[PDB]
Structure formats: structure tokens, C-alpha cells
Scaffold this active site. Sequence first.
Site, PDB file in Angstrom:
ATOM      1  N   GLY B 113      10.014 -12.735  27.628  1.00 39.21           N
ATOM      2  CA  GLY B 113      11.162 -11.924  27.286  1.00 39.21           C
ATOM      3  C   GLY B 113      12.094 -12.579  26.283  1.00 39.21           C
ATOM      4  N   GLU B 280      -7.702   9.655  -8.269  1.00 39.87           N
ATOM      5  CA  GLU B 280      -8.604   9.185  -9.315  1.00 39.87           C
ATOM      6  C   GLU B 280     -10.041   9.105  -8.811  1.00 39.87           C
ATOM      7  N   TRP B 302      -4.189   7.223 -16.414  1.00 42.51           N
ATOM      8  CA  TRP B 302      -5.073   7.376 -17.563  1.00 42.51           C
ATOM      9  C   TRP B 302      -4.381   8.003 -18.767  1.00 42.51           C
ATOM     10  N   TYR B 328     -16.459   7.129 -16.103  1.00 39.90           N
ATOM     11  CA  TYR B 328     -16.663   7.238 -14.664  1.00 39.90           C
ATOM     12  C   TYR B 328     -16.667   8.703 -14.249  1.00 39.90           C
ATOM     13  N   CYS B 388     -14.961  -0.576 -16.524  1.00 38.66           N
ATOM     14  CA  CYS B 388     -14.602  -1.883 -15.989  1.00 38.66           C
ATOM     15  C   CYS B 388     -15.386  -2.207 -14.720  1.00 38.66           C
ATOM     16  N   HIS B 389     -15.404  -1.289 -13.755  1.00 44.19           N
ATOM     17  CA  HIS B 389     -16.307  -1.396 -12.610  1.00 44.19           C
ATOM     18  C   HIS B 389     -17.634  -0.783 -13.040  1.00 44.19           C
ATOM     19  N   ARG B 409     -16.677  -6.204 -14.824  1.00 45.04           N
ATOM     20  CA  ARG B 409     -16.746  -7.093 -15.982  1.00 45.04           C
ATOM     21  C   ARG B 409     -15.366  -7.601 -16.381  1.00 45.04           C
ATOM     22  N   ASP B 412      -7.940  -6.519 -14.526  1.00 45.29           N
ATOM     23  CA  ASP B 412      -6.486  -6.664 -14.594  1.00 45.29           C
ATOM     24  C   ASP B 412      -5.984  -6.916 -13.178  1.00 45.29           C
TER      25      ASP B 412
HETATM   26  N1  LIG Z   1       5.457  -8.253  23.803  1.00 48.60           N
HETATM   27  C1  LIG Z   1       5.572  -9.454  24.579  1.00 48.60           C
HETATM   28  O1  LIG Z   1       4.924 -10.460  24.244  1.00 48.60           O
HETATM   29  C2  LIG Z   1       6.468  -9.515  25.803  1.00 48.60           C
HETATM   30  C3  LIG Z   1       7.336  -8.445  26.061  1.00 48.60           C
HETATM   31  N2  LIG Z   1       8.146  -8.457  27.133  1.00 48.60           N
HETATM   32  C4  LIG Z   1       9.012  -7.337  27.340  1.00 48.60           C
HETATM   33  O2  LIG Z   1      10.345  -7.669  27.133  1.00 48.60           O
HETATM   34  C5  LIG Z   1      11.104  -7.045  28.168  1.00 48.60           C
HETATM   35  C6  LIG Z   1      11.689  -8.067  29.021  1.00 48.60           C
HETATM   36  O3  LIG Z   1      12.403  -9.091  28.375  1.00 48.60           O
HETATM   37  P1  LIG Z   1      13.992  -9.275  28.630  1.00 48.60           P
HETATM   38  O4  LIG Z   1      14.700  -7.919  28.464  1.00 48.60           O
HETATM   39  O5  LIG Z   1      14.589 -10.244  27.630  1.00 48.60           O
HETATM   40  O6  LIG Z   1      14.183  -9.856  30.101  1.00 48.60           O
HETATM   41  P2  LIG Z   1      13.620 -11.295  30.505  1.00 48.60           P
HETATM   42  O7  LIG Z   1      12.126 -11.211  30.641  1.00 48.60           O
HETATM   43  O8  LIG Z   1      13.969 -12.322  29.451  1.00 48.60           O
HETATM   44  O9  LIG Z   1      14.190 -11.735  31.862  1.00 48.60           O
HETATM   45  C7  LIG Z   1      15.559 -11.974  32.035  1.00 48.60           C
HETATM   46  C8  LIG Z   1      15.976 -12.539  33.330  1.00 48.60           C
HETATM   47  O10 LIG Z   1      15.674 -13.918  33.387  1.00 48.60           O
HETATM   48  C9  LIG Z   1      16.756 -14.571  34.035  1.00 48.60           C
HETATM   49  N3  LIG Z   1      17.459 -15.435  33.150  1.00 48.60           N
HETATM   50  C10 LIG Z   1      17.492 -15.364  31.795  1.00 48.60           C
HETATM   51  N4  LIG Z   1      18.266 -16.358  31.312  1.00 48.60           N
HETATM   52  C11 LIG Z   1      18.740 -17.089  32.376  1.00 48.60           C
HETATM   53  C12 LIG Z   1      19.579 -18.223  32.507  1.00 48.60           C
HETATM   54  N5  LIG Z   1      20.137 -18.864  31.292  1.00 48.60           N
HETATM   55  N6  LIG Z   1      19.867 -18.720  33.742  1.00 48.60           N
HETATM   56  C13 LIG Z   1      19.344 -18.112  34.841  1.00 48.60           C
HETATM   57  N7  LIG Z   1      18.547 -17.042  34.768  1.00 48.60           N
HETATM   58  C14 LIG Z   1      18.226 -16.503  33.536  1.00 48.60           C
HETATM   59  C15 LIG Z   1      17.640 -13.519  34.498  1.00 48.60           C
HETATM   60  O11 LIG Z   1      17.215 -13.128  35.771  1.00 48.60           O
HETATM   61  P3  LIG Z   1      18.245 -12.814  36.900  1.00 48.60           P
HETATM   62  O12 LIG Z   1      18.947 -11.483  36.571  1.00 48.60           O
HETATM   63  O13 LIG Z   1      17.530 -12.709  38.181  1.00 48.60           O
HETATM   64  O14 LIG Z   1      19.256 -13.911  37.008  1.00 48.60           O
HETATM   65  C16 LIG Z   1      17.425 -12.470  33.534  1.00 48.60           C
HETATM   66  O15 LIG Z   1      17.829 -11.242  34.025  1.00 48.60           O
HETATM   67  C17 LIG Z   1      10.166  -6.190  28.903  1.00 48.60           C
HETATM   68  O16 LIG Z   1      10.104  -4.933  28.306  1.00 48.60           O
HETATM   69  C18 LIG Z   1       8.920  -6.856  28.734  1.00 48.60           C
HETATM   70  O17 LIG Z   1       7.858  -5.965  28.893  1.00 48.60           O
HETATM   71  C19 LIG Z   1       8.148  -9.512  28.006  1.00 48.60           C
HETATM   72  C20 LIG Z   1       7.298 -10.596  27.786  1.00 48.60           C
HETATM   73  C21 LIG Z   1       6.441 -10.617  26.679  1.00 48.60           C
HETATM   74  N1  LIG Z   2      -5.636  -2.465 -19.483  1.00 50.94           N
HETATM   75  C1  LIG Z   2      -5.853  -1.525 -18.503  1.00 50.94           C
HETATM   76  N2  LIG Z   2      -5.545  -1.778 -17.269  1.00 50.94           N
HETATM   77  C2  LIG Z   2      -5.772  -0.809 -16.280  1.00 50.94           C
HETATM   78  O1  LIG Z   2      -5.493  -1.007 -15.101  1.00 50.94           O
HETATM   79  C3  LIG Z   2      -6.365   0.504 -16.689  1.00 50.94           C
HETATM   80  C4  LIG Z   2      -6.753   1.710 -16.010  1.00 50.94           C
HETATM   81  C5  LIG Z   2      -6.599   2.020 -14.536  1.00 50.94           C
HETATM   82  C6  LIG Z   2      -5.138   1.926 -14.082  1.00 50.94           C
HETATM   83  C7  LIG Z   2      -4.812   1.549 -12.760  1.00 50.94           C
HETATM   84  C8  LIG Z   2      -3.464   1.461 -12.346  1.00 50.94           C
HETATM   85  C9  LIG Z   2      -2.400   1.741 -13.243  1.00 50.94           C
HETATM   86  C10 LIG Z   2      -0.947   1.650 -12.826  1.00 50.94           C
HETATM   87  O2  LIG Z   2      -0.068   1.859 -13.664  1.00 50.94           O
HETATM   88  N3  LIG Z   2      -0.728   1.333 -11.527  1.00 50.94           N
HETATM   89  C11 LIG Z   2       0.441   1.117 -10.720  1.00 50.94           C
HETATM   90  C12 LIG Z   2       0.801  -0.215 -10.382  1.00 50.94           C
HETATM   91  C13 LIG Z   2       1.923  -0.517  -9.594  1.00 50.94           C
HETATM   92  C14 LIG Z   2       2.717   0.528  -9.104  1.00 50.94           C
HETATM   93  C15 LIG Z   2       2.382   1.858  -9.415  1.00 50.94           C
HETATM   94  C16 LIG Z   2       1.255   2.193 -10.211  1.00 50.94           C
HETATM   95  C17 LIG Z   2       1.032   3.677 -10.454  1.00 50.94           C
HETATM   96  O3  LIG Z   2       0.115   4.039 -11.218  1.00 50.94           O
HETATM   97  O4  LIG Z   2       1.753   4.534  -9.889  1.00 50.94           O
HETATM   98  C18 LIG Z   2      -2.732   2.113 -14.569  1.00 50.94           C
HETATM   99  C19 LIG Z   2      -4.079   2.203 -14.980  1.00 50.94           C
HETATM  100  C20 LIG Z   2      -7.249   2.564 -16.972  1.00 50.94           C
HETATM  101  N4  LIG Z   2      -7.201   1.926 -18.202  1.00 50.94           N
HETATM  102  C21 LIG Z   2      -6.663   0.679 -18.006  1.00 50.94           C
HETATM  103  N5  LIG Z   2      -6.411  -0.325 -18.926  1.00 50.94           N
HETATM  104  O1  LIG Z   3     -10.553   0.172 -13.189  1.00 52.71           O
HETATM  105  C1  LIG Z   3     -10.095  -0.626 -13.986  1.00 52.71           C
HETATM  106  N1  LIG Z   3      -9.992  -1.933 -13.667  1.00 52.71           N
HETATM  107  C2  LIG Z   3      -9.487  -2.834 -14.537  1.00 52.71           C
HETATM  108  O2  LIG Z   3      -9.438  -3.986 -14.141  1.00 52.71           O
HETATM  109  N2  LIG Z   3      -9.064  -2.438 -15.775  1.00 52.71           N
HETATM  110  C3  LIG Z   3      -8.492  -3.285 -16.845  1.00 52.71           C
HETATM  111  C4  LIG Z   3      -9.200  -4.638 -17.096  1.00 52.71           C
HETATM  112  C5  LIG Z   3      -8.760  -4.947 -18.543  1.00 52.71           C
HETATM  113  O3  LIG Z   3      -7.453  -5.522 -18.593  1.00 52.71           O
HETATM  114  C6  LIG Z   3      -8.727  -3.554 -19.200  1.00 52.71           C
HETATM  115  C7  LIG Z   3      -9.959  -3.360 -20.090  1.00 52.71           C
HETATM  116  O4  LIG Z   3     -10.300  -4.615 -20.684  1.00 52.71           O
HETATM  117  P1  LIG Z   3     -11.151  -4.338 -22.019  1.00 52.71           P
HETATM  118  O5  LIG Z   3     -10.741  -2.912 -22.628  1.00 52.71           O
HETATM  119  O6  LIG Z   3     -10.879  -5.398 -23.017  1.00 52.71           O
HETATM  120  O7  LIG Z   3     -12.714  -4.326 -21.663  1.00 52.71           O
HETATM  121  O8  LIG Z   3      -8.682  -2.593 -18.105  1.00 52.71           O
HETATM  122  C8  LIG Z   3      -9.155  -1.113 -16.114  1.00 52.71           C
HETATM  123  C9  LIG Z   3      -9.661  -0.201 -15.267  1.00 52.71           C
HETATM  124  F1  LIG Z   3      -9.740   1.096 -15.646  1.00 52.71           F
END
Ligand SMILES: NC(=O)C1=CN([C@@H]2O[C@H](COP(=O)(O)OP(=O)(O)OC[C@H]3O[C@@H](n4cnc5c(N)ncnc54)[C@H](OP(=O)(O)O)[C@@H]3O)[C@@H](O)[C@H]2O)C=CC1
Ligand SMILES: Nc1nc(=O)c2c(Cc3ccc(C(=O)Nc4ccccc4C(=O)O)cc3)c[nH]c2[nH]1
Ligand SMILES: O=c1[nH]c(=O)n([C@H]2C[C@H](O)[C@@H](COP(=O)(O)O)O2)cc1F
Lengths: 507, 507
Positions: B113, B280, B302, B328, B388-389, B409, B412
Site C-alpha cells: 500500500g 496509407e 505523400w 506501392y 523504400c520498403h 534500402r 528516414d
Molecule cells: N497494485 C499493488 O501492487 C498494490 C495495491 N494495493 C492497494 O492499495 C490499497 C491499499 O493501500 P493503502 O490505502 O495505502 O493502505 P495500506 O495498505 O498502506 O495500509 C494502511 C494501514 O497500515 C497501518 N499503518 C500505516 N502506517 C502506519 C504507521 N506509521 N504506524 C502504524 N501503523 C501504520 C495502518 O493500519 P491501522 O489503521 O490498523 O493502524 C494503516 O491504516 C488497496 O486498494 C490495495 O489493494 C496494495 C498493495 C499492493
Molecule cells: N524523404 C522522405 N521521407 C519519407 O518519410 C517519405 C514518405 C513517407 C512519409 C511518412 C511519414 C511522413 C510524416 O510527415 N510523418 C509524421 C511524423 C510525425 C508526426 C506526424 C506525421 C504525420 O504525417 O502526420 C511523411 C512521409 C514518402 N516520401 C518520403 N520521402
Molecule cells: O516508406 C518510406 N520509408 C522511408 O524510410 N522513406 C525515406 C527514406 C529516404 O530518406 C527517402 C528516400 O531516399 P531516396 O529518395 O534517396 O532513395 O524516403 C520514404 C518512404 F516512403
Amino acid sequence: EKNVSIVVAASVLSSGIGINGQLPWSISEDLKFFSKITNNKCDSNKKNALIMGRKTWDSIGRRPLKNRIIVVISSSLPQDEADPNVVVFRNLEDSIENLMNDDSIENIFVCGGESIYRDALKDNFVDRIYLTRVALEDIEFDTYFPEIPETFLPVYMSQTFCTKNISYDFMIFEKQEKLKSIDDTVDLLGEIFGIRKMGNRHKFPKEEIYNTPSIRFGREHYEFQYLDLLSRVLENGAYRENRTGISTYSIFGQMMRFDMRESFPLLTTKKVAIRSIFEELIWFIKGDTNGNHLIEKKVYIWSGNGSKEYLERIGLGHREENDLGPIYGFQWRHYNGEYKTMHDDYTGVGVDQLAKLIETLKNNPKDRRHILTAWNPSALSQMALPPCHVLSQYYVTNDNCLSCNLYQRSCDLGLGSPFNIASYAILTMMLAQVCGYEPGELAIFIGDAHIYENHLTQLKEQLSRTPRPFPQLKFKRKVENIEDFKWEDIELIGYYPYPTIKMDMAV
Amino acid sequence: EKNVSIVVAASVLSSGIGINGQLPWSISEDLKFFSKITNNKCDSNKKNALIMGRKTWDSIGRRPLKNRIIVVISSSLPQDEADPNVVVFRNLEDSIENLMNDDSIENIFVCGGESIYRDALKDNFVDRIYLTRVALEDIEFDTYFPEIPETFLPVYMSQTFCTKNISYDFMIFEKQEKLKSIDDTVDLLGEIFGIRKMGNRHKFPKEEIYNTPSIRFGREHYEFQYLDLLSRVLENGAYRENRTGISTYSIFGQMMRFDMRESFPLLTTKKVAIRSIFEELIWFIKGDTNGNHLIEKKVYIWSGNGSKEYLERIGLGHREENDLGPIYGFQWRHYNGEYKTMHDDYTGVGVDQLAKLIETLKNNPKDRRHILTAWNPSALSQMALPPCHVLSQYYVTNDNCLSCNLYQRSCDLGLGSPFNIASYAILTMMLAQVCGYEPGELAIFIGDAHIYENHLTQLKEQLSRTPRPFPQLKFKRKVENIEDFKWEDIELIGYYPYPTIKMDMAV
Ligand SMILES: NC(=O)C1=CN([C@@H]2O[C@H](COP(=O)(O)OP(=O)(O)OC[C@H]3O[C@@H](n4cnc5c(N)ncnc54)[C@H](OP(=O)(O)O)[C@@H]3O)[C@@H](O)[C@H]2O)C=CC1
Ligand SMILES: Nc1nc(=O)c2c(Cc3ccc(C(=O)Nc4ccccc4C(=O)O)cc3)c[nH]c2[nH]1
Ligand SMILES: O=c1[nH]c(=O)n([C@H]2C[C@H](O)[C@@H](COP(=O)(O)O)O2)cc1F
Ligand SMILES: NC(=O)C1=CN([C@@H]2O[C@H](COP(=O)(O)OP(=O)(O)OC[C@H]3O[C@@H](n4cnc5c(N)ncnc54)[C@H](OP(=O)(O)O)[C@@H]3O)[C@@H](O)[C@H]2O)C=CC1
Ligand SMILES: CN(Cc1cnc2nc(N)nc(N)c2n1)c1ccc(C(=O)N[C@@H](CCC(=O)O)C(=O)O)cc1
Ligand SMILES: CN(Cc1cnc2nc(N)nc(N)c2n1)c1ccc(C(=O)N[C@@H](CCC(=O)O)C(=O)O)cc1
Ligand SMILES: Nc1nc(=O)c2c(Cc3ccc(C(=O)Nc4ccccc4C(=O)O)cc3)c[nH]c2[nH]1
Ligand SMILES: O=c1[nH]c(=O)n([C@H]2C[C@H](O)[C@@H](COP(=O)(O)O)O2)cc1F
């Protein structure tokens, strides 16, 4: 206890390190490697000690090495306190006094001839080995590097480098002795979700199918790009049927990466038929689809898909014996051309992709459209076999190097893949010379990566062989046109592979 | 000094964990995660302690958890020694006596917890946080998880999982405190050889351009496959000119891998226009090359390459305003068809690859030739822009899932790549429903991966945003033909992205 490492440069097969009181080679980068490792220290007010035999101390001119203290093992040299950078000891054991006494010595390096290496290993003084494997074996040696004991395991193997057409590696060997929560969480998530977690669909290969499994973080040699793909298929491959009677273990979507600047990607774990690879590639380049022209040159890789029984079986009985139809080399030179037979004259018809590729690589190098495709849906029905290496792209770097990418839809890892690696490497080097560039990198992207079930014992045998440095490949002459290459023009230097492995092709 | 970890399942944006004394959701796999993590121990004769508040102790029915000892914090519960599996303490600090006294407790888990979480963090008792990020935000909460202090850093982020159409992650946070020779050897080899060593051509990205750099070994969320490619280009990209006036930083030969079984690869670090992506894609599927049909639906991606000024500039002044030419969807549905204008009727002409692909995916699922290409050299001159592919392959797994590989081949990374990832994911799911399969994996192989220089400040902003779980995408109805999909048929569930980032396209 301080560290004691061995630095040595030995030949790849026989482990020769010297001849007639000097080295069998002159590799500049290897000396710079020796210098940087023996100078590598952590404390500013400390130095490293380099132990060497007397004959080695003679071979380096009997002169000190900067920033280091040389320790010479000799039974007859004067122990004069004149030179503070050189000290003499009567045996190797006494010279290891720097550990217990001298606190001004940080690390210790053994690097001085066969006699000192063999005693340093027999007495268990060495913690680590820095080995430089050199690809030179048809020469004479008289000083060798001892066999590495089983207590050492390889932990690193660099890529292959090249100096004066000589290939060499860099390896590290460690001696065997006797993040924590992240791996546990991933394992627990893998128990909850089955094959819902994508990691469980790409399981790491077990050690029993992992080539040289002691090399965990240093798998730099690019032959591991092929060997690990084999391991990945043996681990995750799905048993699937296909058009042949031989089922495969298949995964989808894999890649391999190879260097071509300093080496040539010809596999060393198996003797690859390089001559057949070339004669098939020039067959593609010339635009030829006549399968007889390969058989006339004693190359029978296309005989299986070019028999009269196979063509009539797939609905091409009208075709001649070895007329494979419009395939590689017909889409390269005459794309979308109307295919009749293999004897007709196709000059002028179709789109010459290879010619446009060469002209575009020279006139617009940074263009992004250097594409060579072979997948033509309008001609697939007429092909004896759809193309496996379907599309390739080429790239000119800013330092005038030519890289190559290949997508292959289907990959026989036992037979086709070793050929595809070497074939497109040669093509890239050919394109580089005709266009005036140097070779770059090779990447192969694979769709259906599979292993035929009758290759399992063969490929498991290949995975048991630790790789060796890649060879070199050079052209003996500059050609006018790319079609003019001949087998005699290729000089394969430094290829020392493992014995060949026989594997039957699935028709 | 034992370990004290927090286990919690909180909402992705507002960090809600409870409502009206219970959870805001029912995710079965998350409970199995809670069970496996709190039972994970090393000693057989030891137990873990689970601290929780009283209200949390009420919400689980006031019943013990097997193999564990529950610690309840309460000011009013009786401290009866009757139940050995449940103990009560008056405050949180006193209950941390498990460290000093009880040596029978191995690890400690805080999971009870908001009140207990906030006190455990304000008093600096927590060493590690196990966070389950849930993608549910337009609902009601009354109990939240406190903001994580800056002393914690994320070290792991799993892939996105799905239960009852709800996306969720698994993360680990470590608290900050106050393989050695291999890295040294590789660094030295990188000093000797310049760009001769291939590793130096593929340098690891610097921390200032590495998204969430504290996650070193746990980059499992497959949005890192895209974000790290951005980092890899910012580190190694070569400044190169191109056909447009906007230069790029370019590398060659990259890949991205995405899951589609448990999530949909729509980027969360930027609000992606998903409607334009779909409009695409259906534009491609219908075979349409009329750029006005996209502009009429307020989609202008494109319009840049379809202006009268751009078309006349590239030599297509004869063309109508937004007539993009055979692109393609014209190679998809009418391959090798003679293109006239965008107004003509092309029914029956060309090779319908999409139709053959769907028919092949259903009748021969394990066929290795499920290929859809768009690279037609005979039509490139007529296209407003080359594809390219360029080529995609599809694969049916043994458990009836449909995976997809794409070779691109030119990429990018600012604009095209987020579209290409989502577009081919949607296309694969459409093909899966029409063929009766489930979505599989998506792998994208890239040639020229580049970043336009006018996108640098934008993409650096995007790299500053830690990713969120991928959303879900479901179809509201089963369609008869693949052309029948509409935007209203798509339901995007659990998409809570970061604000959109404006980037201009280079024409
Ligand atoms: N996903 C995961 O890996 C895990 C998830 N969980 C989940 O988390 C939830 C439980 O965690 P959480 O809400 O934090 O509760 P806890 O499991 O941490 O248990 C808390 C209890 O431990 C005692 N305690 C804590 N601190 C002290 C202290 N300083 N001195 C004396 N006693 C203390 C108290 O008991 P008291 O009141 O008796 O004094 C307190 O009520 C659950 O939903 C569980 O399923 C739990 C484990 C793992
Ligand atoms: N030189 C060169 N490189 C190439 O990849 C290429 C392709 C294929 C291609 C693939 C991806 C993009 C591109 O812009 N991608 C993105 C990236 C980040 C965030 C958003 C986008 C988005 O598209 O929304 C453009 C083109 C055709 N001809 C090419 N020539
Ligand atoms: O599917 C693709 N994958 C890719 O890697 N390119 C990039 C590689 C390179 O930067 C450019 C083409 O290189 P070139 O025209 O010199 O062969 O397109 C383009 C695509 F369409
Ligand atoms: N590739 C490489 O990494 C290296 C190659 N080399 C090559 O190897 C060759 C030299 O090696 P190598 O032939 O083995 O000669 P060494 O370098 O091992 O030197 C041997 C000398 O060291 C002394 N010595 C050796 N063992 C003992 C002992 N147990 N007790 C006392 N003194 C001892 C002796 O000196 P003394 O006669 O005075 O008693 C002996 O003659 C050269 O060609 C050299 O170039 C050398 C180093 C590295
Ligand atoms: C002992 N020896 C023979 C030799 C030759 N190659 C080797 N190569 C390897 N990998 N390991 C060895 N031990 C080795 N030893 C040596 C030692 C130093 C130099 C030498 O001139 N070293 C300079 C190299 C200077 C430079 O090239 O920048 C240095 O500063 O260390 C030559 C031969
Ligand atoms: C304290 N609490 C609330 C609750 C719910 N979801 C959470 N999810 C996370 N990630 N972390 C929490 N702390 C958490 N806590 C709990 C604790 C245990 C069980 C429960 O039944 N646990 C069983 C798991 C039963 C199963 O595997 O189905 C167990 O064996 O631990 C339910 C709610
Ligand atoms: N299924 C299937 N797989 C294929 O590889 C394939 C090919 C190409 C090809 C490639 C290589 C071989 C082959 O036999 N290679 C060798 C291996 C080890 C030792 C020697 C050789 C040698 O050739 O000398 C056969 C054929 C065409 N059609 C095919 N169909
Ligand atoms: O260069 C080649 N590479 C390759 O891997 N194959 C294999 C792959 C597959 O095992 C076989 C048949 O291809 P498919 O069954 O897809 O028609 O050809 C063939 C080639 F010519």
C-alpha cells in the site's frame, strides 16, 4: 601474487615462432601489439618486467626496451649492476623473485623463446597467454611455441587482420581455477509466459552445440557470425517439411556480418570449394543460363536442378536438358526479357541491372538506389528454381569503400550459405575494382534459415573445430570489363582450412 | 544486512495501484510474478518476509501466503503468537528487526500500500524496486505508488506482455552506492588499427546519446531496437549529401526486431499518427496510386513527392498533380503492368502478388517463397519515388503464427521508420486474419539507415524519454476480403505516448 602473461606470435598450424635466430616474418602491427601490452600498467611509479632467453636477448640487438625492465635468463651472462633496465638471472624460477620481493614490479611478461616458454608452462607459472596466430605455414622453422596445456581456455579471438597479404589473429587464453537479480527475473518471467515471451523463442544455444564455448565475450572473429547461426538453428529450429523429401530445422529472420577490408570471408572450419563458387559467379555476370557451361568446367552444383527428370517433374518438359531458364544472370542482364531458350541471342533485350549498377556506383556513389534484384514474379514459373539470393544493395562509404547487403529468402546453412558468403564477397570486390573502390563490409539478411536433417552429424562435426584466421584474396590484374575475370586471376593467400565435409544436396 | 526490495504493480502514467480497497485490474500473470519473486530464496531452511499495511492485509482476505511470513504494520492489531506465519508490528522501523534479530529470514519484500511504500522510501530502507507498469489510465484510482527517488536507476525493462487486452511491463530499479583484460586488449587493437578494425567502424554509442543508459543488460523492450539504432547512427553516422538539399548521417546494414504476439510495435517515445499509417496501408492494398485519395482523407504524407513543382523537377511534368505513378500497391496488385494514368482501370492487368501471397499462405504454409516485392527496374523511371520498403517475406510457424521480414534500402529514422514499423505490423496482422493465423514476429533489415540533419535536436529529445509499454491493436470484425478493412474496424488499446515531435520531410 602478481600477473604473469605469455606474449608470443606463432604460426597457425605448426606454431613456429623463429628461424635461424630471428622471426619468420616482419609484421609491424604485431610489434606495436607487443609494445602496448607490455607497457599497459595501472601504477605510474611502477614498471613491467619482460622475461626472455639469452638467444632472444641477442635477436633484439641486446638493447633495452623503453619504460620496461628486461630480465634475461642465462647461465653465462655477467650479473653487472651497470644497466638498471636489464637484469640477468641463472634460472627461470629465481627470476620470479619479483613477485615476493620487488614491489616496484606490477606485472610480469614471459616472451623469450621456446626454452623459456616450455619451462614457464611446465612449472605452472603462466596465468594468461597472448597468442598472435600468423597464417604462414609453407616455410621453415626451428623454434616452436609449446602446445598449450588443457588448463588454459580461450576467451578471445579477434577479427582477422592483414599485413603484406599475411593474415593474422589475436587470441587470449586464461588459466582455469576451481546483474545477479536481472538474470533471475528474466528466468521467472520465462516460466510464467511460455513461448509468449519472445526470449524463449530465441533461446541461447546450449554449450554442447556452441563452437568454442569458452569464448563468451570475445567472439570477434566473423566466422562466428556463421557458426553461431548454426548453433542458433540447432537450438530453436522447428522441424518442418518442404518440397524435397528431406525435412529441415528452420528459424526465420537472421543476419550475418563480415569484414572484407582486412580479410576474405572464406570459412576455415571446412575446406570450401572456392573454384566452383567463382565459376558460378562469373556465369551469372556473363548473363549465362546454360547449365552445360558449368558442367564443361567440372562444376556440377546445378546438375541436380537441371536434369530432364526434374524439369518434367515441375512442368518444364519442353525444356532442354540443362536449360535452367531465366534465373540469376538473366534477371541481372536482361530483366523482364522474353525468355525463349538458352541458345538465343538476348543482346539488347531486358534491363541490364549490372551495367546500370556499375555506371551508377561510379557517377553517383552516395545514391541510395544501388539495387540488384532477381525476384521477377512474371518469370518465376519459367525458372528451374526461384532465386534464393533475391535482392542485394551496394553502398559507397566516404573513404571509397564498397559495402554490400544481401537478402536471401531461403538459406541452406550446410551447402548454400558458405557459397553465398564467398560468392557475394567476390562480386563486391569485382565491383570495387571496376568502379575504383576498395572492399568494405558484407551483411547477409536471411529469411528461412534452415539445416537439412541429413547434415546434422556433419554440421555438429564442423562446430567442434575452433576457427582459424580468414585467408586473403587478391586479383592478379585490373580488368577492363567485369566480364573479363578468369579463375587464373584469383590468388588465394593464407587459406589453411580444416578437412572438407561431405554433404548431399536435397533436390 | 539483508536485501529489502519493493514489489508493486502501478499504472504507467499516474501510478495508481488501488481503488476502494482492491486492485484496479485483474492480471493473472502479475500475481504469479509476485509469487515467484517473493518465494525466490537460496537457503532451504529460511523464509522471506513480506511487509504490508493493514488495509492491504484486509484486501487479500487476511489469509497467509504459503512458504512465506507476512508482516503487517498496524496500530491496532493484536500481536498474538497464535499464527506463526503472520506477525504484527506497530511501526515500519521496528519491523525491520528482521535484519538484526531473525536470522531465519533471508530476504525482505515491501509490497503493502501507499502508506508503507512512501515511508519505506522516505526512510531509505529500499535497495531495489520491482515495478510492473500497467497500461490503464482512463479509470479511477484512490491509492498511488510514490515517485521513485533519484537515488534509484532502472536496470531492466522487459518486453510488453498482454492479458485481457491490457499491456504491461516489468522493470527493476537499483539504488546507487558510492572480462577485465579482454576490454583492454580490444582497446589496444583499436589504437593500432584505425578504421581497419571493424569494431571501430561500429563504435558503441556514448552515454549522452544512449536512451536510458542505466539499463545496460536489460534492454528487453523492443522499442530499444529502434532507439538504439538512433543512438548507433548519432555515433557512427557519416555526413553525406543526397538528392535533396538536406544532408544526413548515414550507416549501412542494420536490423530491428519486434514482437507482435503480445503487443503492437507502435512507438511510445513519440505520439505516432496511427490513422495516417493505416490509411496509407489500405491505400497500398487497394492498389491505389492516386495521391488525392489520401489528401481527401486528411493524410498529407505523400503530398510532398506529388506536387506539380516536384514532379516537373524530376522529369514528370506530363503527370497530373498527385499522380504518383506505379508505386506501392501497383507492383503489389498489378506487377509489370503498363502504367498510363491514375484514372485508368487496371483490373486484370499485371501480376497480383498480394492475391497470390494470400492464396499461397493458406494452401502451402511452409512454402519458402511467400514474397511481396516492389522493386521493378522497368518502372522505376515512371515512379514519383523508388520504393523504400522494397521486398518482404512471410513465414508460417508450426504454431500457426505469421511472421514478416522486410528489407528497406533507405530509412528516414525520424519520419519513415516509425511508419514502416507500424505499417508492416498492421499488414502482417491483416494477412494473418484472412489466412486464419495469429501475428508472429517482425524483423526489418535496413540498407541506408540515416538521420536528416534537421532532425538532430528532435531525435535527441526523443532519446531523453524512457519508453513505455507497447499498446495493443485489435480488429473489431473478421473481413471477407483484405480490401474491406476500414479505420473504424481498428481498436488501439492502451496507447499512452509522449507528446508528438514535429519533423519536416525532405522533398
Ligand atoms: N497494485 C499493488 O501492487 C498494490 C495495491 N494495493 C492497494 O492499495 C490499497 C491499499 O493501500 P493503502 O490505502 O495505502 O493502505 P495500506 O495498505 O498502506 O495500509 C494502511 C494501514 O497500515 C497501518 N499503518 C500505516 N502506517 C502506519 C504507521 N506509521 N504506524 C502504524 N501503523 C501504520 C495502518 O493500519 P491501522 O489503521 O490498523 O493502524 C494503516 O491504516 C488497496 O486498494 C490495495 O489493494 C496494495 C498493495 C499492493
Ligand atoms: N524523404 C522522405 N521521407 C519519407 O518519410 C517519405 C514518405 C513517407 C512519409 C511518412 C511519414 C511522413 C510524416 O510527415 N510523418 C509524421 C511524423 C510525425 C508526426 C506526424 C506525421 C504525420 O504525417 O502526420 C511523411 C512521409 C514518402 N516520401 C518520403 N520521402
Ligand atoms: O516508406 C518510406 N520509408 C522511408 O524510410 N522513406 C525515406 C527514406 C529516404 O530518406 C527517402 C528516400 O531516399 P531516396 O529518395 O534517396 O532513395 O524516403 C520514404 C518512404 F516512403
Ligand atoms: N615469435 C615470437 O613471439 C618470438 C620468437 N623468438 C624466436 O625464437 C628464437 C629463439 O628462441 P630459443 O631458440 O628457444 O632460444 P631462447 O630465446 O629460449 O634462449 C635460450 C637461452 O636462454 C638461456 N636458458 C634457457 N633455458 C635455461 C635454463 N633452464 N637455465 C639457464 N639458462 C637457460 C640459455 O642461455 P645461455 O646459453 O647463456 O646459458 C639459452 O641459451 C629466435 O629465433 C627468436 O627470434 C623469440 C621470442 C619471441
Ligand atoms: C622479444 N622480441 C621478439 C618478438 C617478436 N614478435 C613478437 N610478437 C608477439 N606477439 N609476442 C612476442 N613475444 C614477440 N617477440 C621482441 C621484443 C621487442 C621488439 C621491439 O622492437 N619492440 C618495440 C616495438 C616498437 C614499435 O613497433 O612501436 C617496443 O617498443 O616494444 C622486437 C622483438
Ligand atoms: C499484497 N497483494 C496485493 C498485490 C497485487 N498485485 C501486486 N502486483 C505486484 N507486481 N506487486 C505487488 N506487491 C502486488 N500486490 C497481494 C499479494 C498476494 C496475492 C496472491 O494471491 N498471491 C499468490 C499468487 C497466486 C497465484 O499465483 O495465482 C501467492 O502465492 O503469492 C494477491 C495480492
Ligand atoms: N537445396 C539446395 N541447396 C543448394 O545449395 C542449391 C544450389 C546451390 C549449390 C551450392 C553448393 C552446392 C554443393 O554441393 N557444395 C559443396 C559443399 C561441400 C563441398 C563441396 C561442394 C561442391 O560443390 O564442390 C550445391 C548447390 C542450387 N540449388 C540448390 N538447392
Ligand atoms: O544460393 C543458394 N542458397 C541456398 O541457400 N539455396 C537453398 C535454400 C533451400 O534449402 C533450397 C531450396 O529453396 P526453396 O525450397 O525455398 O525453393 O535452396 C539455394 C541456392 F541456390
